[PDB]
């Protein structure tokens, strides 16, 4: 079992924190917020680095490029912005979605960006030119998450419409629709680090590990509270193999991936833990919470 304990609490955002992500090189933590700002922090010591500003309304997601040099954010101003970490410059503003942008990610090569929106579409953008390459009529309700697979050949999307869908990056064809015997909103999805599974959250207090190629649910993770918000979930692979997620009872939940048992609950936040992230090489978890809390917390474990 892990032994995560609190090391740092990071105050700075003036509204709910919407996402936290460690840079692939392990150096930084990026946070986004309803306060319209992205903030960069030292991953190991929590030391504030810089604020990145530009969006006109709150931000729902931020993501790193594979080389840790760029970030992309999605906002209620209906744009995405591509940022250069070193300079803080907005290199491109991606305009095309007709409603709020909810989620975003680079592909492994960091030459494409995928985005999901309240306009019910998934869009694929060229990073270099900042132009919209494809618009997929993906869902019948807002798109809650989008993620590229290990080689970038596939995109997985999730939606409040209750569906998880797999898309061919090149053609834009819908290759698969995944759903279980109940039809609750799907609030989050991502491929596993090894690329052969997807982890999906639904708003019935349940996380599920799918073999997406076979279309079978392999594992379910329960114990947490999730009926309202699109809470991030993660694979922890640096020490023991865990599943990590936020919860609406104000705690971070950690499960054993294989046994599906709850192995730890991290207490400290004063509001719903909306976002969590796992560091790429060290046993470090970042967590952040909604309007009544406004803080980010860094937890560390020897296992």
């Amino acid at each position: 079992k892990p032994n995560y304990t609190l090391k740092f609490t990071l105050a700075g955002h003036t509204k709910a924190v919407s996402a936290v992500k460690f840079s692939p090189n392990g150096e930084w933590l990026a946070s986004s917020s309803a306060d319209k700002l992205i903030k960069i922090w030292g991953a190991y010591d929590g030391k504030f680095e810089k604020t990145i500003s530009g969006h006109k309304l709150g931000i729902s997601d931020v993501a790193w490029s594979s080389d840790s040099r760029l970030l992309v954010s999605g906002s209620d101003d209906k744009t995405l912005k591509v940022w250069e970490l070193s300079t803080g410059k907005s290199l491109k503003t991606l305009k095309g979605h007709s409603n709020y942008v909810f989620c975003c990610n680079f592909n492994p090569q960091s030459n494409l960006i995928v985005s999901g929106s309240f306009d019910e579409s998934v869009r694929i953008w060229d990073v270099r030119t900042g132009k919209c390459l494809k618009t997929l009529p993906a869902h019948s309700d807002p798109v809650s998450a989008v993620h590229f697979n290990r080689d970038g050949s596939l995109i997985v999307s999730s939606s409040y419409d209750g569906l998880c869908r797999i898309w061919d990056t090149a053609s834009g064809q819908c290759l698969k629709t995944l759903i279980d015997d109940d039809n609750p909103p799907v609030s989050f999805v991502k491929f596993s680090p090894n690329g052969k599974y997807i982890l999906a959250a639904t708003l019935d207090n349940t996380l599920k590990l799918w073999d997406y190629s076979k279309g079978k649910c392999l594992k379910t993770y329960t114990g947490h509270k999730n009926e309202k918000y699109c809470i991030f979930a993660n694979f922890s692979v640096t020490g023991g193999k865990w599943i990590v997620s936020g919860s609406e009872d104000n705690m971070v939940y950690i499960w054993n991936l294989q046994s599906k048992e709850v192995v730890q609950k991290l207490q400290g936040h004063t509001d719903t833990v909306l976002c969590t992230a796992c560091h790429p090489t060290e046993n470090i978890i970042a967590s952040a919470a909604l309007e009544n809390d406004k803080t980010i917390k860094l937890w560390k474990s020897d296992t």
């Binding site: 509204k15 709910a16 919407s18 709150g58 909810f102 309240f118 708003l203 309202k228 909604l290 309007e291």
Partner: peptide, 9 residues
């Protein structure tokens, strides 16, 4: 609040 910080309608 931004979209992710708004609860299920």
């Amino acid at each position: 609040l931004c979209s992710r910080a708004r609860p299920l309608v």
